[PDB]
Design a protein around this ligand. Structure first.
Ligand SMILES: Cc1cc2nc3c(=O)[nH]c(=O)nc-3n(C[C@H](O)[C@H](O)[C@H](O)COP(=O)(O)OP(=O)(O)OC[C@H]3O[C@@H](n4cnc5c(N)ncnc54)[C@H](O)[C@@H]3O)c2cc1C
Ligand SMILES: Cc1cc2nc3c(=O)[nH]c(=O)nc-3n(C[C@H](O)[C@H](O)[C@H](O)COP(=O)(O)OP(=O)(O)OC[C@H]3O[C@@H](n4cnc5c(N)ncnc54)[C@H](O)[C@@H]3O)c2cc1C
Ligand SMILES: Cc1ccc(CNC[C@@H](C)O)s1
Lengths: 588, 588
């Protein structure tokens, strides 16, 4: 029925006021709470489908059925008159604060997900604390509040991606009539890092202010869940203590892996160090083949660097592989070299990194190909991008009872709840969910609404669009081609595709048939669009809008009746017609 | 019902074949028709929702009920045996060219819609001619086949727009670490015009080649409808003749208007001349407030030009005015000077345009503001953008019977048919249709299928998306805000909005709170999105995809449940919460 909704809501909420929009008694109580600097959620019963039933079940707690009723942490406080009797007796503050625990919510991890959840939580009166600590890299790198996206992920790579795109702007400017000469222009890595770190510092500080100004307690300490309500924190001065919270949210992210080979941890770096490195990396070897490894080799080339990528097997494993190879074939034609079907054996240090004069060392990389041929080349820097993983042993005592899948990730129900009942996990460590910063923000905000404001909304994790920020960007939404065929069979899958050329690339004398797009649709379902794929500039801005249509179950008919915006790259989606089965060429 | 469709198809198609995929006799006929280079439409009866009735209704024409059946211009030709007997006896070619008119279709106008139409009809066996003539401008500017967009519209304008954006890229490159100094680079106008014209020329040639390869007769002559089936053509030599056609499509577009003031036609120019001008315009007065006027003033300013814009009343009349005002504020903050509430009286000539040294003339402009105060200033170039109009006088003889609305645009039923039963109109001259290149193309293609292949699909003109390619671009889809309030009332309209700042603008030190987007919704229709509006970079790429979701009736919840792609500008549409009635600020 409706009853157990109301028991969960009243039991979980901190300060909550069942109210009416038109009732003047309720309105005077609200303004009392505002003047009292008392935050709370407000369930206005007159704008819900069955508010009349909810007033009936309110009597199951309060022996009354009128409005307003105020509750604090499961307890019925009183009706109108009762609460202002507390106010002009000055007993209100004592009763709204009193609680079995120190906090209504402890969040372990101050990243995209945790900070999102704590800021939405304190909005509804939940007494909240948020914990964040950055264990240093093996060479000692460190950064402030915000998470992986803010300090060592989406933010600084797209800015470094942007510095690389700008090199083609300088090339293109001549053909559009600008007097400059691209041949006479070099890049300065340190000036870039300083501007990138300046914007990161603004984000760091701005998060501390958001927490300060929302009544969230920020603790720069490493917390560890020892029991289902108990968190054991460690100071900057290694000082250890214990706080307690009613509800706990785990959101501590992942960190870079290294291969188990000698020299790796000692002499190489990872993405965590690349964004604040104080010297240009020089001649660089990137080991791996995920979006991290391509994106970084991507801009490192565009800034004049001598870049090699060492690929064990395939590029972008798990993405559509036609597009993967189109991505990779572009980078190879524009500077990035690849050593295909090759794997590393050890790293020898020939020269130490020169802190004083600000210059890299010199390394020797020993490898072998699959056939058995041997690799051996000198490199000034070696970056490892061979995956990321959580380390929940540092965060979670075995004995508390939280179930971990075979990767170390947290098994949650579809509302983010662990096996222990009052503990939840969001973000990269939620098992089998897409590891993206906008996902972690939605899970975090939609969970806080459910805990402290009686919400029902769940996070939808399906058909979440992505974009890979390689020199030519690749945005995608939905299934890949190979996956659609495997799920429904080659006969039932029809693919529309077509090359294109940006107008902007005409005067600039760029390639005619590298930019490509395709719609993978299902025949026996009115040609429903299953996945969408585009390789070209601004692929992120192109793809986004269609993510809404695809959540709404778009079909090829819907794309055909929508008119294009001319001249854009994106309008090519509105008039696709060549089918893969037909065999007709997709060139311009 | 089925009855009158079949009769309409058989009477207008040129060569049509009624068939089934499974049949081997029709496969036999297809193979013979393909061999003889005979182009035809082909219904596949075993693929239609009611082929049992379409088959049975065919007997009204062939006195037979089987398949295949081939018709030519309303006449039943024969079954399988009867067709091969014509083939094997050398009679089949003459039957399929037997026609009452010179052409199955004559298209008056070789621009966006007309080129699209003739090429589609040719592809179904229709014998087609397209006519195209470029009436020279007052100073005699003239160009090649393609239309207004190709030669003097979207294509050269976005290329000059792009030259303008690249000046901000040369600026921003400094702050991402590149050595260059923006302050010592200049722009060469003629080099850019050379590159742009070069690409226009390759479109001119491609369109000639495409009409050749579809066997479309291309007459570079001026056409004129003298009777429902008689078109009068006039040579480059003035050689007048007459051709006949079964179906006629009007697609003659528009041309720029001039104000009725002394010196306008003698000493000013329009956009028709600007895109191939041999000298730089210099100090320039732009008279108007349309998207033509602002887009041109925009890039002209970004190229180093001293630019002024003379506004009668408001900017972008017809578009959401809050957006328009923000568009104008940005230009005024980045160069362009505005003479507000001002109108011109006369243009005087102080200096004649110098062909020899390739420099502009010099003019004196006199006007007055709306309060009698005087305007007087010198400019080297004066560009009129005071609207456009057709001149159907020059193409449509009064006595044919084609009816015009009070603007001079053709009045059409929602299938593009005029008051005369066999004459149709597409593109700009179609009354009350949005005047855009993609609209013309879709109208022209969908019509040609209905006429020569039994199609039924109409063109949808509602909710067509637009982008104004000013220095900050502005893209939109659906109603303006004032329009939505006007139709439903303030109480029923809710507006969600937010500023934003592209990530690319952080390191480059650009403005914090200039970029803006909003969604206008209907409270009583489930918060249906009635209009989308965004101001910022790549606004065309941003908007296009969202047009599809609006076309399927997207609501606010649909935008909420879709996850953003990060870091993009476009992702801000997925987390909008501040409302206008709320009174909260939309800054960041
Ligand atoms: C190089 C790179 C580029 C990326 N680019 C993109 C991109 O373009 N778009 C995108 O959507 N995603 C991108 N991602 C992924 C994105 O960063 C993650 O999806 C997101 O950061 C996950 O957020 P989270 O809140 O789950 O974890 P995090 O953001 O990693 O937050 C976890 C935080 O908790 C801290 N912590 C850990 N253990 C403890 C502890 N015991 N006590 C206290 N605090 C602790 C961590 O130090 C960190 O501060 C990128 C990732 C990388 C590595
Ligand atoms: C500066 C500018 C910028 C624009 N930018 C955009 C944009 O970014 N996006 C967009 O969607 N739209 C844009 N437009 C509008 C776009 O150009 C039109 O919507 C489009 O050209 C409509 O095509 P049409 O076939 O109706 O007319 P047209 O393309 O003008 O075709 C008409 C053709 O018929 C010829 N003709 C005329 N009379 C005769 C005759 N008697 N005999 C033979 N031929 C004849 C004309 O010379 C012309 O070649 C822009 C317009 C301008 C002026
Ligand atoms: C013609 C114009 C209408 C609006 C313009 C720019 N806004 C100026 C305002 C802030 O005074 S220019």
């Amino acid at each position: 029925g409706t009853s157990q909704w109301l028991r969960k809501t009243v039991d979980s909420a901190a300060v909550i006021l069942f109210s009416k929009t038109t009732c003047p008694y309720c309105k005077k109580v609200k303004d009392v709470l505002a003047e009292a600097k008392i935050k709370h959620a407000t369930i206005e019963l007159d704008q819900l489908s069955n508010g009349s039933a909810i007033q009936k079940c309110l009597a199951s707690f309060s022996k009354i059925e009128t409005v307003p009723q105020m509750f604090v942490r499961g307890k019925f406080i009183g009706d109108s008159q009762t609460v202002l009797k507390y106010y002009s007796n000055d007993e209100l503050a004592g009763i709204v604060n009193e609680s079995k625990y120190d906090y209504d919510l402890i969040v372990i991890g101050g990243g995209s997900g945790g900070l999102a959840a704590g800021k939405e939580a304190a909005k509804y009166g939940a007494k909240t604390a948020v914990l964040d600590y950055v264990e240093p890299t093996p060479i000692g790198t460190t950064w402030g509040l915000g998470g992986t996206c803010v300090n060592v992920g989406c933010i600084p790579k797209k800015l470094m991606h942007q510095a690389g795109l700008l090199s083609h702007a300088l090339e293109d400017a001549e053909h559009f009539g600008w007097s400059l000469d691209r041949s006479k222009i070099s890049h300065n890595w340190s000036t870039m890092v300083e501007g990138v770190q300046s914007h990161i510092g603004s984000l760091n500080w701005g998060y501390k202010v958001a927490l300060r100004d929302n009544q969230v307690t920020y603790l720069n300490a490493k917390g560890r869940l020892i029991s289902p309500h108990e968190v054991q924190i460690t100071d900057k001065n290694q000082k250890v203590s214990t706080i307690t919270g009613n509800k706990i949210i785990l959101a501590t992210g992942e960190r870079p892996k290294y291969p188990e080979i000698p020299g790796a941890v000692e002499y190489g770096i990872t993405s965590d160090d690349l964004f604040s490195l104080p010297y240009f990396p020089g001649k660089t070897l990137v080991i791996g083949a995920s979006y991290v490894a391509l994106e970084c080799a991507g801009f490192l080339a565009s800034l004049g660097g001598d870049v090699t990528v060492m690929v064990r097997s395939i590029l972008l494993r798990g993405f559509d592989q036609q597009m993967a190879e189109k991505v990779g074939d572009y980078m190879e034609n524009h500077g990035v070299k690849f050593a295909k079907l090759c794997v590393p054996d050890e790293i020898k240090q020939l020269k130490v990194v020169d802190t004083e004069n600000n210059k890299p060392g010199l390394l020797l990389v020993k490898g072998h190909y699959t056939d058995g041929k041997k690799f051996e080349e000198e490199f000034e820097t070696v970056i490892f991008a061979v995956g990321r993983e959580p380390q929940l042993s540092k965060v979670l005592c075995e004995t508390v009872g939280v179930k971990l899948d075979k990767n170390g990730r947290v098994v949650c129900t579809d509302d983010e709840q662990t096996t222990v009942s009052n503990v939840y996990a969001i973000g990269d460590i939620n098992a089998g969910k897409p590891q993206l910063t906008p996902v972690a923000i939605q899970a975090g905000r939609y969970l806080a609404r459910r805990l402290f404001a009686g919400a029902t909304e769940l996070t939808d994790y399906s058909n979440v669009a992505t974009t890979v920020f390689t020199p030519l960007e690749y945005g995608a939404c939905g299934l890949s081609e190979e996956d659609a065929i495997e799920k429904y069979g080659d006969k039932d899958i029809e693919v529309y595709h077509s090359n294109f050329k940006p107008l902007e690339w005409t005067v600039a004398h760029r390639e005619d048939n590298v930019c490509y797009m395709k719609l993978v649709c299902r025949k026996s379902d009115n040609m429903r669009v299953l996945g969408l794929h585009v390789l070209g500039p601004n692929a992120g801005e192109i793809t986004q809008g269609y993510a809404v249509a695809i959540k709404m179950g778009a079909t090829k008919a819907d794309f055909d009746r929508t008119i294009g915006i001319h001249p854009t790259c994106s309008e090519t989606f509105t008039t696709l017609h060549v089918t893969k089965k037909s065999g007709v060429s997709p060139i311009v």
